[PDB]
Specification:
By secondary structure, the protein is mostly beta strands. It has two domains: about 1-85 and about 135-155, Chitinase A, domain 3; about 90-135, Thrombin, subunit H (Beta Barrel). The protein is about 5% helix and about 45% strand. The protein has one helix at about 55-60; strands at about 1-10, 20-30, 35-40, 45-50, 70-75, 90-95, 110-115, 115-125, 130-135, 145-155. The strands form two sheets. Strands 1, 2, 3, 4, 5 and 10 form a six-stranded antiparallel beta sheet that branches. A hairpin with a 4-residue loop joins strand 8 (about 115-125) and strand 9. The protein is elongated and about 60 Å long. It catalyses: [protein]-peptidylproline (omega=180) = [protein]-peptidylproline (omega=0). One of its GO terms (molecular function) is transforming growth factor beta receptor binding. Belongs to the FKBP-type PPIase family. FKBP1 subfamily. Its main location: cytoplasm.
Length: about 160
């Protein structure tokens, strides 16, 4: 699930509700603390509507527990973030499928035709007779930690 630890208190009175626009500054990190996203690095607060599923479940339920002005640590499990690692989204392609006359790089990300539709995949390994294509989210299976400050509530 998601756990909320207060960093700085809010007003303890105004809390997000469905359909309301929450305005936040956030820093996203892996469990070890390595940063992967931060609205503060863009100098732009991040806005999202509660209940619209514009953010992960840990945010939907975690930010709802925060009052305006509050800064809090959100500890989020994979099921409440970008999901567990899906082994069905990893496959070995015999290399014949790829038909470029120029470099085919490990780490290249692109939209591939999948049974679920055109979705992003990544070449994570190339072997002599096989290419490993991984469609998992880059953060799949990762416990995440967010520094979130609820700057405003709007509607």
């Amino acid at each position: 699930g998601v756990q909320v630890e207060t960093i700085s208190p809010g007003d303890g009175r105004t809390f997000p509700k469905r359909g309301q626009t929450a305005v936040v500054h956030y820093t996203g990190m892996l469990e070890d603390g390595k940063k992967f996203d931060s609205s503060r690095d863009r100098n732009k607060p991040f806005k999202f509507m509660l209940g619209k599923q514009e953010v992960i479940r840990g945010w939907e339920e975690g930010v709802a527990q925060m009052s305006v002005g509050q800064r809090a640590k959100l500890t989020i499990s994979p099921d409440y973030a970008y999901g567990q690692y899906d082994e069905n989204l990893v496959q070995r392609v015999p290399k014949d499928v790829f038909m470029g006359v120029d470099e085919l790089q490990v780490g290249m990300r692109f939209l591939a035709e999948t049974d679920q539709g055109p979705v992003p995949v990544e070449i994570t390994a190339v072997e002599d007779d096989h290419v490993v294509v991984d469609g998992n989210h880059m953060l799949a299976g990762q416990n995440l930690v967010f520094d979130v400050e609820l700057l405003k509530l709007e509607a």
